[PDB]
Write an enzyme that holds these catalytic residues in place. Structure first.
Site, short mmCIF file in Angstrom:
data_model
loop_
_atom_site.label_atom_id
_atom_site.label_comp_id
_atom_site.label_asym_id
_atom_site.label_seq_id
_atom_site.Cartn_x
_atom_site.Cartn_y
_atom_site.Cartn_z
N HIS A 44 0.81 -1.23 0.00
CA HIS A 44 0.00 0.00 0.00
C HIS A 44 0.84 1.27 0.00
O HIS A 44 0.32 2.37 -0.26
CB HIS A 44 -0.98 0.03 1.18
CG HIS A 44 -0.35 0.38 2.49
ND1 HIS A 44 -0.02 -0.58 3.43
CD2 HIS A 44 0.01 1.57 3.02
CE1 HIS A 44 0.51 0.01 4.49
NE2 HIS A 44 0.54 1.32 4.26
N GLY A 192 3.49 6.35 9.01
CA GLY A 192 4.86 6.71 8.69
C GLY A 192 5.82 5.53 8.84
O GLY A 192 6.91 5.52 8.28
N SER A 194 4.83 2.36 8.09
CA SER A 194 4.44 1.39 7.09
C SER A 194 5.55 0.93 6.16
O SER A 194 6.40 1.72 5.71
CB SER A 194 3.31 1.97 6.26
OG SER A 194 2.07 1.72 6.94
#
Ligand SMILES: *[C@@H]1O[C@H](CO)[C@@H](O)[C@H](O[C@@H]2O[C@@H](C)[C@@H](O)[C@@H](O)[C@@H]2O)[C@H]1NC(C)=O
Ligand SMILES: *[C@@H]1O[C@H](CO)[C@@H](O)[C@H](O)[C@H]1NC(C)=O
Lengths: 243, 243, 243, 242
Positions: A44, A192, A194
Site C-alpha cells: 500500500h 509513517g 508502514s
C-alpha cells in the site's frame, strides 16, 4: 513509533526510508534491505496506482531523516498481484535498486525467516521507523530513527481482540493467516512506519517476522498493530530476490 | 456530490443527514428513509467501533444543513455482521429511529427494488448528498443538498477499469457482486455523500439501487464510484425492517 | 528567504536562530551575533509581551536547523522602548547570552556600520535566514541556511512604491527614517527570516545594514522588504553592548 | 463575539456582513448601515490594497450568515487617507452602495453620535457580529449573529493596561485619542467581527460609539478590545455621507 526510544547508531542496519518528490524528498514509508539490490516494503506504500519511478527514491539507513541523504533511484517496483485498493491482504512489495549497495557493519541485509518460524508469543521483537510517536503526533525534528519492543499476540487471540467493541460477526475473520500481530496500548508502530520491519531475535539471529501494515489507531486498547507475515510470502519473494 | 446542482425542494424526500456531536451537530454521512422508523446507510459510516448513540443524530430532508435542524435520536444501530475495518464488502447498516416519522409529500420513504432488478447501464439514476464538490473541496455554505445524474457501469466492465494502471492481478476481483458502479470523470459522489442513496427511475418509479460506499478519488478517470448494491441485501434488511 | 540558495558553510558566521519551546526547540526568528555575548534581533520576535526566558534559546551558526543543535540560554532581553504592538517602527531588540561565546572563523560577530553609512542603491547586500522560500511555503527539510542578494531601494522611492495601489495618502509617510528597503519580485526575505541580518559588502568589509522586519507579502511586486536600519539605533545599541 | 449569546431577530437592524469571492461569498468583516446608501466599516477590512470591487459584496442584516443572502454590489470604497499597512490609526472606511436600500423595522440605520459624546465608563454598550467565539474558535453553523455587552474602559486606564506585561515605555502611548476601549476577559469581539459596530444606549437612543478594530488576542486579561472612535471622524464621514 509509539512508546519507544531513539535507536543507537549500530542497530537496524537494514532500515530504509522511502521518499516521494514534493518540494523535497519526503518520507512516506519505511522498508528493509533484504538483499544488496532489493528492498522489502508494504504494497500500500507504493500504491494505489502504478507509480512513475522518477517520483520515488530510497534512503539507506541514516540516524536522522533528511540530513545526510544519499538518495537511490529505483529500477523496478513489484507489488504482490493479490493486493488491491481498500483491503489488507497481501500487503507486500519489492523495490529493485538500479545497482547493489555497499555492504558494511552500518548498512547490510536482514535475514528472512525460515518457513517454519511462527514467531509465537513471548518472542522478543522490535519494530523500527520514523513514523508518528502517537496518534496525529508526528516525529519532531531532527527526525531520529526510533525503535520499540512489541509483544506478539497469537493470531486467533488477536482476531478475537479485534472483535471486542465491533459489529463484526465472531465467525467473520478479521486477522488472516498472512498477517501477524504485535504491540499493546503502550508500544506500537504507527503512520509513517508502514513498510518498515518487525524483527525478532531467534537463537541469537535477527529475522524479519513482519512488514508494518495497518492497525486501528496507534497503540489503541485491544487493537495490536498488524503486520504482513513474511513467511507466508517467501515463495513469491524468492521468485525475484536471489537466495 | 461532484458536477451536479442544488436539488429542488420537492425532490429526494428520503434523503437524511447523519450528525456527530462536535462543536455543533456536524454532518458526516448521508442516509435514506426506507421506512417511517428506519434509515438505511453505510456500515463504514457508523464504524469503525460500536458507537455511543448519545453522539449521533438523524436529520430528515432539509434544503440546507444546520439551518432548520430538527434532530432525531437513534434507538439502535445494526451493522451487517460480515462488515469489518479496511474491507469494503457488505458496507451497509440500519438506524432505528426512536419513533416513526410523520410521512408527508415533503418527507417520505424511498422504495427498495425487487430482487430481480439489475440496474443495467443506461438506467437514469441520481445520487444525492452534502459531500465534497470535488477532491478536497467541501460543500460551501449554505450547504444546499446536491444531486447529479450518474451513468451506471456493468460490474465486469467496472472491475476491468479498476485494474487499469493498477498492480492488482487480472484474475483478482476488485468489484464484487454486492457492489454496483456509477459515475464518470465529470459526475460522481464523494467524501460526505457516503451512506447516501443512488436512486434510479424505473418504469415511472424511484428505486434505491445503491448506498454511497467508496471509490478511488472522486470523479477520477476510469474510477467510477462504488455503491453497495441494495438488491443483494434485501433479505438482511427485511430481517429488521417491516414491509 | 525567497529566490536564493543554500549558503556555503564558511559564510555568515554571525547568523543565529532563535528557538521557542514547543514539541521541540522550534525556530521562529533569526538574529545576529554582534558581540561575543550579544545577539541583535527584531523586537516583534520577542514580542508582544515580556517573554519567560525559560521558553527561549539561541542557536549559533549551523548549516542545518535541529541537526547539530547546541542551544544557549538567554540572560536578558532588551526591547527598544519605543516599540509596541501593531506598529513597525523601532523594531529592534537585544539578547544577552548567559556566557560570551567562543569566537572562531566558523562563528564570530558581524561589524556594525558607522553612523554615516547610508547603504545607498547599488550596494551589494545579502539577507540570510531559515524562513519561507515563498508565500506560505516553509523552508523544507533538512532546513539549510539560505542567502539571497537583494537590491537596495532609497527610502523615498520605496515609500512611493508602497503608495502604489494603496489607499494611503501621498502625504502620509509609510517608510520612515529608521527603516531601509531591499528586495524585488524575485529576491527577498520572508516569514521566519525576521530578526535576521541584511549585510552589505562595503570597502572589503561586511557591515550589518539591517534587521529583517516586515513587508507586504514576500517578493511581491512594488513591495520591497523593510528592514530596521541599524545605523539609526547605534546609540541605543551601544548603551548596552560593549565596544 | 466572545461570551455572548445569539441576538434576537429584532436587534441591530443596522448590522451588515462584508463578503469576498472565494468558492462562495465568504464573510470576512462586519459593517453598519449609517445611511440608506452607505456602510461604515474598518479600513483594514478593505485592505491591504485597493480592491477590485467585483470581488466584494454587502449583506444587510440576516439572522444566519449565508442562508438567506441577497448580496449587494458596491459602488465605491473610501478609506481614510491616514490609514496604512501595519498600524492602527484611522481604521475607518466607507462603502457606497449602488443604490439606497429599503428602510424598515428589520433593516435600518444606526445613529452616529454627537461630537461631544465621550462614552465614559459605565455606559451600556454592545458589540455585534459573526466572528470567532473564542481564540482560534470560529462561530459554528448555522452562523447566528451574536451580541455581547462590553464595559467601557477610560482611554488612559486602557493605555496603562496595555503596558502591563509589555516592554513598551510608559511614556509611549499605545491607545490613541481616535480609539476607544471596551470589554474584559469574559466579553469581547474577535476575528471576524472587524468593521462591525459597538453601540451604546444613551438616553434611550442607540448610538454607534465604535468600529471593531483590533486587540491583543480575544477576551485576554488586561487587553480590552480596541475600537475606532467614531466621534473623531465625524467630519471626514460628513464629507461623504449626507
Ligand atoms: C424595496 O421595496 C420594494 C417595495 O417593498 C420592493 O418592490 C423592492 O424589490 C425590488 O423591486 C420589485 C419591483 C421587484 O423587481 C423585486 O424583485 C426587487 O427586488 C425592494 N428592493 C429590494 C432591492 O429589495
Ligand atoms: C561503495 O564503496 C566504495 C569503497 O568505499 C566507494 O568508493 C563507492 O563510492 C561506494 N558506492 C556508493 C554508492 O557509495
Amino acid at each position: 513509533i509509539v512508546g519507544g526510544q531513539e535507536a543507537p547508531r549500530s542497530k537496524w542496519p537494514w532500515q530504509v526510508s522511502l521518499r516521494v518528490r514534493d518540494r523535497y524528498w519526503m518520507h512516506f514509508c519505511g522498508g528493509s534491505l533484504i538483499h544488496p539490490q532489493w528492498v522489502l516494503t508494504a504494497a500500500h506504500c507504493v500504491g494505489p496506482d502504478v507509480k512513475d519511478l522518477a517520483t520515488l527514491r530510497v534512503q539507506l539507513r541514516e540516524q536522522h531523516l533528511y540530513y545526510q541523504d544519499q538518495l537511490l533511484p529505483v529500477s523496478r517496483i513489484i507489488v504482490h498481484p493479490q493486493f488491491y485498493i481498500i483491503q489488507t491482504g497481501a500487503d507486500i512489495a519489492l523495490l529493485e535498486l538500479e545497482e547493489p549497495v555497499n555492504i558494511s557493519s552500518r548498512v547490510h541485509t536482514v535475514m528472512l525467516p525460515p518457513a517454519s518460524e511462527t514467531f509465537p508469543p513471548g518472542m522478543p521483537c522490535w519494530v523500527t521507523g520514523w513514523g508518528d510517536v502517537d496518534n496525529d503526533e508526528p516525529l519532531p525534528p531532527p527526525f531520529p530513527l526510533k525503535q520499540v519492543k512489541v509483544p506478539i499476540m497469537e493470531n486467533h487471540i488477536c482476531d478475537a481482540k479485534y472483535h471486542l467493541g465491533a459489529y463484526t460477526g465472531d465467525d467473520v475473520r478479521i486477522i488472516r493467516d498472512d498477517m501477524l500481530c504485535a504491540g499493546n496500548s503502550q508500544r506500537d508502530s504507527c503512520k509513517g512506519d508502514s513498510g518498515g520491519p518487525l524483527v525478532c531475535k531467534v537463537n541469537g539471529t535477527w529475522l524479519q517476522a513482519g512488514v508494518v501494515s495497518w492497525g486501528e489507531g496507534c497503540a489503541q486498547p485491544n487493537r495490536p498493530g498488524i503486520y504482513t507475515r513474511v513467511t507466508y510470502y517467501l515463495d513469491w519473494i524468492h521468485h525475484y530476490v536471489p537466495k
